[model samples]
Target chain A: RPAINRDNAFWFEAAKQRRLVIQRCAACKTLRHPPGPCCPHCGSFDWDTVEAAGTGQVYSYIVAHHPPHPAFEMPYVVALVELTEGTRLVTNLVGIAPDKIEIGMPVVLDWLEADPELTLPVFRPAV
Target chain B: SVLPGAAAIAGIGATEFSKNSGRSELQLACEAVLAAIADAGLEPSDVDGLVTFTADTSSEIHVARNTGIGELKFFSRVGYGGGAACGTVQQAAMAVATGIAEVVVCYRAFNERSGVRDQGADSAAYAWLLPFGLNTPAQWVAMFARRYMHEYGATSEDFGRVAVVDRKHAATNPKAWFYQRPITLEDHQNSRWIVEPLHLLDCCQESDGGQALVVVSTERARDLPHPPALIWGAAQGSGYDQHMMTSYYRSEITGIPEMGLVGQQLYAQSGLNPSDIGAAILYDHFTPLVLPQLEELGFCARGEAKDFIADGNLEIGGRLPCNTHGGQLGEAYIHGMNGIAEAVRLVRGTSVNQPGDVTNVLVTAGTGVPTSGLILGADRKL
Candidate 1:
């Protein structure tokens, strides 16, 4: 099957104006990825989309020297990030050399509006 | 609680393990089933129950009909990859223990090498968590292995030691596919990395073959032709946040707590401690996970497997002889099915590397996931 890069409406809609939205749980006060309808923790089923502090630290990462998937390019850095609020998210690191990626490296959320159809959350070295 | 009575495996059988067996998977299943019945000196008509793995393409009734067996009074399938190996017999044992059937045959047959070429990576469909780079078992394990190294300071060399010993033992067993093809620690170090910290030698080979066992009540088992390996205890375990190998969400990533949970129950039920086990048939899909399993099962203290495995402890005539049939690493990797047959061999005194006492054997299934295990012994109690 062909790959489809699709994001939820909450993120996509906010990305129209280049704003990043993160969903926070009402019960345990944890943030979730892709802006879910309900809290992933405690299942309060109540949430609000908030603009992230736009800052996080690399949790783990791998440098893709070989592109296994055609949708992505080689020499890209895929990273799992721990945001300032402690929510973990998976995204790509851009605007930085792939060799510089390391665990706990400070990063800031950035926009990668690939064409008018897609806008992804890519991370960059913190300002 | 319904008591599980004494059910012993009266017969064990298998088709040759190979890279290519020019036959249908169903044919392999039938051949193994027939071999098992012959070993037990029982006719196909004697089997009234059957059990197998859920992942198996062949159905129980379909296999029964193809194998010339009569109507089945009880039939079931166990889920989880290799964990279902012994649990299949456990289900049959329950049927015999409950008097629901006279003889139950548990069988697993597959042309894994010929049929589905690749068994690891998910190509078509995957759950939400599985699609994002966590597609293959090696990648998932690398995550855990890396985490374990980070947390406990375990080294890749520690994992490589398992492969070194397994290949050494596999080299001696004539029936092992890798027999006489033993690998060295240097070879392990030089082998291409499938995933960081996991060498190519650490992964199990894809094999084409089948294995079957006949389980009957101890009373009837005594009448069978061969010695019966009693089903002392059988258990299936899955821990919290369990999802195949993608269990990174759990509190700790170093050890497999689920396997420990199964080990606890099996030891309790079988009334056998680690020292009481004459030998073991540990699943060796990858070498790195075996160390944690040894620790979790209390075979040795945590972080001491490096010391325990240093001097051929798991090899033939060692402290605890394991995987005498070469395991998946040396033997054909049949998803732990051949491991079960090897246990039966140990009980029957037919194993190539037979340990001193042949009373009890501990067998485990797949690790890094919601796995299962078993404790097989002689029909007579200790």
Candidate 2:
């Protein structure tokens, strides 16, 4: 289970609601993900969330082959998906074969509610 | 200004590199620290400061008490995994340059194979990736490596050359973990995959060892037992859109901008460019990042390192022999500390795989995150 700290609580909450939210610095209007406390660009404490389009391309990805995590089977595809809002998230690709995943391949958001306590955003191939 | 050429590594010491150290991490820390102090031809009490990785098991106070060093005036730890390798030395140099400490020794001790490797313990980035099964170092690096190959037209062979060269050098150096076990490029290609774009041979060997280096005033270094490897320039950097190993936010995923900043500072501080370097010890924690480091450090233009590496330029007798001590890939992954010691050997002309007239050597810590770099020169030009 992922340690849900205060900084990332909202993100997890939104994931639970079946929404993908990225933190946006209210002052600079710059978008950031893997949420943080303040804006690195404007150094502003004021921030808000923007619901992403839930559609994007695979910027980069990896295929894990060793020391399998309990949640996943062996040789899983971990993807770096770039949302339409221009923010990237580290999540896994669902509904796609390992060979089918490509950089710049378009994907849509999905949810992985591994447990009642944890809900994660995953990506799937879009026609 | 005193930071450059004002301090020199007067001594370097290390425990054996192995899969199982069979001893406590603290014992490894104490042994290496004592050996480093002895190598400098100085007593333990002569040390007034210490620095190490925040990821290390041993703290300044822990090493101070066990190693018989007196009260410390300045003690600090650098963050990030192997990125902290040169940063510790940088901290020590700053401490020495400002008269905060007379003799500072930087040390790193770990039993990564036998004991749990909490190397990225503080990383929040890992938290996001762990659930997705991107749980290992090789997997994290694989993300960037795959993109790097896409952008640069590089191949598995390009990354394999890095391994083959390091193993070839490691074959001769008995201190190397892979000593006398050189692998061919074909061997690298045939090795099983830890992740896409990174073969088993690509990932650095997980070893248990300790490595330490003694830093002192260049003037004081002149009185030491061995020729000092002068600290020409030292710099640490975190690039734009930094996010540990999961730095996917940037517009470009192919290059490491953090090392580009470190490279800028290193060349500017050292007043030496790529051509001045006789050899280099590029941290091969994962072999793929070595290409970007060469490009970032101005060894070659971006996207040109694959060709640079493939031309046998990185091997001994090339334009600038790289990883002459076999590097972390073949020597030992003491969190890049062993590579620092080899930088000293390169400058002192004591490495088993020595290159010609090696007046300067550039050493970089790990990449794909915040990192550090240093340039060691043969002369105390300051």
Candidate 3:
């Protein structure tokens, strides 16, 4: 896995503690994923974090099987999971077969220790 | 106001569609430009403008020097990979319409198969996707393909119908890479999956080729060797909540709204409706996107393209013959530039599978991104 840079270091640091968080605009209270420096809707540079419920539904997903990247197992599912707080992030789905995944399927967040200093937020099917 | 009927595509040209050109991209570009100039019955010096994709490695000055074209008055580049295909022509047409330059040529050349591959790890855009195994273009597109199926009850078979139609047209087009090699729908379903829901047949070929078109004023086009493919309308658009490939945040991920915007502008500028189009060249980078593209272009009701295509409307002598030069799926993915060339051929009645009375031909660029489109027609009469 790649090391987190300064722009994204905050989110990875939060994930290490198993706290799922997203950026909320300081000006408009709007939330965003894949954190950026400024809010796209309000263009506010000031922002803070909001802890999520660590639960969501699968908005869409793909079962990747090609070009063989070293960091991943073959035939793994990558999903766009919409957080309960109303923003979506790309993450892996676990404990589900490629043939069984469905849109709007319930899922919950789980953390992955990708490297010594890096942690990732992943998802799995919710019972 | 838009610049409709102000300029026309006077000539079109291409090098042989191949997996390996055994030459530099610059050399390929020069050959195609010279060929296009000759096809339009003009000298190399007649070309005063140049336009190409920002993704193209060959520089405009270098192309002009090697092709014997003199100093240029206008030069520009459009971005966003295959989405820039028709936008290149739009830039040239605008140049001619505004008198910024008289004769402009739009070209794209690459050895996508034999040379550089797009599977690079450098883009910041893919930073979020890379760690989770959403690593390839196939994977990026599969996300949308899966959602489209889940929403419309569309199956992989519906997507495969697009491939079958493209290859059927390719089987007759001598210029297509898949010429004489049409495949059955079963072949599409049976092909190995690159990503679940996206079979190998659903992907367009990574081709090594070059294509170019000459754009000039409508008055000048009337005197050219071949009948002009007048620029009836040209427009480019990007949609709300847009991301590079798949913007899953949107309320509805099932449609390509950017292309719908382009279609609206195209119809408004051209003063024509879907009923007036005799042929079409919808981009076919991925088979799934073709369905939404047809609907976005107003050819059918939303989520009804599966039925529209299944009724044999895209075939020769059908409602609107499409991809008569085989499309990128069957011809070559010179990044959608070849499809624009096919539009010109259809207007001139020179395509290998040319439809009868092709007065208006609709051509679209790559979908799932900020895209462009064009409506070309036969020479306007006094």
Candidate 4:
């Protein structure tokens, strides 16, 4: 199975304030969205959680008009978000029409508290 | 402006292409990597670079540990599923030529048959495309193939011809999963429809297996057992408004513009024209793309590929013997790795149905999306 390096402290804290977090390698100064132990660059083992710029640009997206999974509603925008710091993160773009999200459009982090243990990182058009 | 060098594929290896490998993807990758290293007359400690598709289950570090490799200096992953087949080798070639890595290995392994059956309609695609009435590959291609035929005056019979040639080649190759199961044009026509204008015979089959190749400097490769089949050129291109196989929104649906980009770069880099190529390994994931690929690659004028294919020019000993190892249609679809291996065999003059003096072979990965191509020459500089 593919490993998921989930940080409860980082995610839980971010969930409280409706913020999104990405791990930045302290040694290499590289940002990674999906948490991992070592840096993909420089192979540095030391890392710290950093707040996402809150603003990002849409890279590519598709709307699942008919979702099989019950958790996801139909016609929702699943997008690859290009953060301001030049990192890509995949998340859903909520509170907007799916067709309205164009590539390179600015969006801000919009967190969703899915469960007591998990908080999903979503996005919306930034003001 | 760093030009790539003539790095050779010193080793070719694979697990048995079958319906069930009955093992983890990591083990499959390890088996292929070890086989490739041994085939190249090297040890596991010699490898430094590794490349694979983003969709592959095995990670570079995990594969290295499982395969017992020592150190890694360069590692990369290409995207777009099957389009990354030859691109993997291209990445390794670039790494080897630039002195970033000495010995680079590329591998792809999966339980395609057992794990995620792709031949039928799935929830993902059904949820994504089916509700919109774009169901399977056949349907996806049908939307475009129909438009192409309408605009170019190409008939469905012309499309069936590709399946005939692929199955014919597969019938003679013992390693082909479809060995001895040749299909005629009548069979292709009579086959049940998965989607209109694309019969069951038109689509490639899903298989459970793995493929790997080792790339190194031509200088290092010359010291190995086999003659170096050098990488003359490699390029990837995405066409205007490209959208996987369902890019029907484009102004022109008759031809693949993405392949034209690759073709232009290949000609510029290889310093050779299309006429100089002896054979081709055109991606045959679906038959509709074959004609456009021929047109895009300058094998013939635009929309003239149907005539070229209709005249029986894609067969062995023809102007361009394509998919001599049966392609994805007749051979197992390990994406497009088998096609690359066949290109190596053509360069080595070891193909079962060998063509005459195959000095330069053209190979392509998946089309419709961001795709890649490679020109493999017997002994040429990149």
User: TM-score winner among the candidates?
Assistant: 3
DockQ-based CAPRI category assigned to the predicted complex of candidate 1 = incorrect
Native contacts present in each candidate (fraction): 0.00, 0.62, 0.64, 0.00
User: Per-residue CA lDDT of candidate 3, range B69-144, in tens?
Assistant: 9799999999889889999999999998888999999999999999965223235456688778786777888888
- Give the residue spans of candidate 1 off by over 4 A: A1-127, B1-5, B116-131
Candidate 1 or 4, higher lDDT? 4
Q: After superposition, how far is residue B279 of candidate 1 from its true place, in Å?
A: 1.8
lDDT of 4 at B127: 26
Put down candidate 1 lDDT per residue, B254-363, tens digits, no spaces. 78898898899888888778888888888888887888888888988877777788766787778788888888888887788789988988988988778766788888
List where candidate 2 sits over 4 angstroms from the true fold: B116-124, B380-382
lDDT of 2 by residue, A1-127 (tens): 6655667768778888998898999999998876788898889999999898889998888887765578778778888888898878889988887887778988988888788877888999985
Instruction: Please list the residue runs of candidate 4 whose C-alpha ends up more than 4 Å from where it truly belongs after superposition.
Output: A1-127, B1-4, B116-130
* C-alpha RMSD by candidate, in order: 4.3, 2.1, 2.1, 10.8
Displacement of the residue A45 alpha carbon in candidate 4, Å = 38
Candidate 1: C-alpha RMSD after superposition: 4.3
Superposed model 3: Cα runs more than 4 Å off: A1-7, B116-122
Which residue pairs clash within candidate 3? Answer: none
